[PDB]
């Protein structure tokens, strides 16, 4: 069954790149929070996939 399933992607390349550009001083958690909160606000105004 697994032979025909692609290995799931570890991470999203674009989101990881955007997060690291926001990040400073190694504070990745803060950077991920800012992006997720910003994308959460985009969904709540557009109601589409941010």
């Amino acid at each position: 069954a697994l032979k025909s399933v692609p290995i799931p992607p570890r991470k999203n390349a674009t989101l990881d790149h955007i997060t690291n550009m926001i990040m400073r001083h190694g504070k990745k958690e803060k950077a991920q929070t800012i992006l997720s909160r910003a994308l959460y606000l985009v969904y709540c105004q557009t109601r589409q996939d941010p």
Partner: protein, 124 residues
């Protein structure tokens, strides 16, 4: 002759593997179950606050699409949250091979059976 003996489940059906990342170490007990996880006796959301650390632990189970087929009792010590979460990730991948040795190639290809060697280097 060789020094390798086939790994097998113990008397309680548990696969025990050890993993290391940075200064952290993790000893996990994997048994067939329904997806229950305990880290040092604590809930996963309690011990690991970062969702990215939780996702790293789940990745090996996501590769073999067996996230709801095993109960994990992970014990970890040393380093910080990232080292411990990825040390558990490495140990779960090594413990899952006993349940089905045919999936080792998929685990190796995903990169979860490789021990990360990077550690803090004294400046030279």
């Amino acid at each position: 002759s060789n020094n390798i003996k086939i790994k097998t489940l113990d008397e309680f059906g548990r696969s025990i593997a050890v993993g290391k990342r940075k200064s952290s170490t993790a000893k996990v007990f994997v048994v067939r179950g329904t997806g229950e996880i305990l880290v040092n006796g604590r809930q996963l959301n309690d011990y690991f606050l970062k969702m990215k650390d939780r996702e790293s632990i789940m990745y090996p189970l996501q590769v073999i699409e067996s996230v709801g087929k095993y109960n994990i009792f992970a014990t970890t010590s040393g380093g910080g949250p990232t080292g411990q979460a990825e040390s558990i990730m490495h140990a779960i991948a090594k413990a899952l091979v006993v349940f089905n040795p045919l999936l080792k190639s998929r685990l190796h290809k995903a990169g979860v059976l490789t021990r990360d060697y990077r550690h803090v280097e004294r400046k030279k």
